Amino acid sequence: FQICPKRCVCQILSPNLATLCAKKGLLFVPPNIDRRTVELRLADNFVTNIKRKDFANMTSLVDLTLSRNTISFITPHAFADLRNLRALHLNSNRLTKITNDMFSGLSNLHHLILNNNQLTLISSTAFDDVFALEELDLSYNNLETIPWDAVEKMVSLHTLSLDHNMIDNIPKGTFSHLHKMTRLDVTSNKLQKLPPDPLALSFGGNPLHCNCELLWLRRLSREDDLETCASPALLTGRYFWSIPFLCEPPLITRHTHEMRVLEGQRATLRCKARGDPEPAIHWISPEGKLILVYDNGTLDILITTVKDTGAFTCIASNPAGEATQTVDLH
Amino acid sequence: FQICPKRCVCQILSPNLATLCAKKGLLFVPPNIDRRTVELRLADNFVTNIKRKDFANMTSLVDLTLSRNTISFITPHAFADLRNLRALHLNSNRLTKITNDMFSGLSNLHHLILNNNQLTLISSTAFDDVFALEELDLSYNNLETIPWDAVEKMVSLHTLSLDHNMIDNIPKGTFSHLHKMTRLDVTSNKLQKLPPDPLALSFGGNPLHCNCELLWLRRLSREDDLETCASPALLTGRYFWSIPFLCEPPLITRHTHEMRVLEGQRATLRCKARGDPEPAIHWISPEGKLILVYDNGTLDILITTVKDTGAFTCIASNPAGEATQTVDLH
Questions:
Q1: How many CB contacts within 8 angstroms connect chain A with chain B?
Q2: Continuous segment of H or E residues that includes residue B216
Q3: d(CA B130, CA B166)
Q4: What is the residue range of B314's domain?
Q5: How far apart are CA A54 and CA A45, in angstroms?
Q6: Which residues pair with B65 in a beta bridge?
Q7: B60 and chain A: CB distance < 8 Å anywhere?
Q8: How many CB atoms lie within 10 A of CB A227?
Q9: Is B68 left (phi over 0), alpha (psi -120 to 50) or beta?
Q10: In what order do the strands lie in the sheet with B293-294?
């Protein structure tokens, strides 16, 4: 009568004790859960908040189920004492953000399931303690990015599911360190490009920008999962097609009218250049390169020192090539 | 070759023409869809935006499927020309709000399916044109309220699914006008009370406040769907239990210290009263009731006219009874 809460069913076999509370119409975690429990099933319930005291001394706890719940909040160090937790199920809940201290102390955690959650953000340090992970399920969320750097340190990781979210891009470093990697799912995300990395990848629901940039993936010999394009004259055609897949090199449409300038003025020289992909505007002083500047492609430096009031050159550049245009100063 | 888009399969039987585009990896609605189509299947695709021009002259269109898509936006009058649409599937998408002009002109619409969407708000007039509805599926959303008034005018409505959302309350008028009503699902919502209305209702995932207020539902003879309480000493017990289910009548814990007042001052007299449910604070002038006031339970009137500077009475009241306390003015 003491080892099992009145709402729960639970069985003992040899050393192991399981606690089964799934589909009990529970509103919170029963506190009478024996701290010797190895298995905890709390799925199909209605818990909204995880207090600290809920899993205070579950040293023996290996598997936890909190699937299909109404969870919106988890106390900062609720999972801290779970040094043995191998798998944690938090799928089908109402969590909006993964906090920094949420998954602290989960060194043995190999399976993290957070699919079907309303996730927008993840605090960067959130995945620093779960470095052991084999499976990371972040599908069916509103994510634009995940802590990519923290992931590079999951060296035993084999599945990273990111399907049905809004991921803009994947950094080029990516999974170089993850050698045991098997599956990567990026279907149904707002992705225009994919980084040229050395290769099971699924990416069929993305608004692909088909440039000479996404050519490496076209050159590859893989199955058609109905990938479709959103580039200029390719806005509808199924991706796996004829390679003419061409870029528009940089071209300076607008440039600063030749100006004499004045002493003691923060001179602004705008450089407009069109291309596919958008060119990187770089600035050059008369006989010397520059490193202030603006993302758009404009230069601004205070007092306009007469020491360097010569021919200023603006360089537009993308993989298709370069473009040059000069602007006066006297 | 003209009646069917190249990505779609479609069949003709007698007068009826169906267009089948499900699971085609589409990013937008093909414009080459024949305006004679009676059935349109676009489920299992990746459309984000519904342009006006997509369904411009689908006079014959009866059923539309846009299930399992990435839809975040639908142009204000996209469905206006669908005078024959009987059912519309918008489940499993990324819509956040139902706008005023979204479902305009859907007079024949009997089935509106919007489950599994990230819905927060609904503009009040949104359901004014869909008065014919038989089925309204708003499950698996983030809703706190729906246009209840607009619903009262769905007199042929038989199913209203509101499960797995965050509904705070249901107005007391409710479904008096809806006589053909069969099922109401309010499971897994943040509901403390249910209005005493004349009776298939499911409500098993709510943080019930068990007062003498929710007694009518306890007195009823219905099946246990594992309903649980969150009242003072009943915070865990399964709802279907012993009726002692008691209220705490109103009691004025704090009251305004007897004051003489001054001429030309906006006199503020606070009246604090505790109860279960919270009492309604009402004010009474010496020999005359009042109708300014504050929600908390405070009175404030400018210039403090000497005409009524007598004994002011404060009344706290809930279903369990009344409470009285006097405050001076001279």
A1: 47
A2: helix B215-219
A3: 23
A4: 248-329
A5: 15
A6: B41, B89
A7: no
A8: 21
A9: left
A10: B248-255, B267-276, B298-301, B293-294
The token pair at A154 is 């999951």
Q: Residue B283's closest CA among B298, B265, B267?
A: B298
For B304, the token pair is 């403090």
Looking at this protein, which amino acid is placed at residue B246? L
Burial A288-302, CB ≥16 within 10 A → b, else e: eeeeeeeeebbbebe
Q: Cα dihedral sign for A19, A20, A22, A27?
A: negative
CB contact under 8 A, A188 and B227: no
- Write out the two tokens for A50: 């995880």
Look up tokens 């709510």; give the residue: B206
Asked if residue B272 lies in contact with residue B252, where contact means CB atoms within 8 angstroms, the answer is: yes
CA count, 13 A, side-chain hemisphere, A80: 13
3-state secondary structure of B284: strand
Nearest alpha-carbon partner for A59 in A44, A31, A40: A40
Tokens 């390719």 label which residue?
Answer: A234
User: How many CB atoms sit inside 10 A of residue A86's CB?
Assistant: 16
Task: State the amino acid at position A47 in one-letter form.
Answer: V
B207 → chain A, closest CA residue? A27
A285-290 contacts at long range (C-beta below 8 A, 24 or more positions apart) = A285/A310, A285/A312, A286/A310, A286/A311, A286/A312
User: Pairing mode, if any, of strands B39-41 and B16-20?
Assistant: parallel
d(CA B215, CA B313) in angstroms, rounded, equals: 32
Method: X-ray
Rounded Cα gap, residues B27 and B245, in angstroms? 55
What is the sign of the dihedral through the CA atoms of B236, B239, B241 and B243?
A: positive
A230 near B CB under 8 A: yes
Query: Can you tell me the distance from the alpha carbon of B68 to that of B47, in angstroms, rounded to the nearest whole number?
Result: 9
A46 to chain B, any CB pair closer than 8 A? The answer is: yes
This PDB structure is determined at a resolution in Å of: 3.0
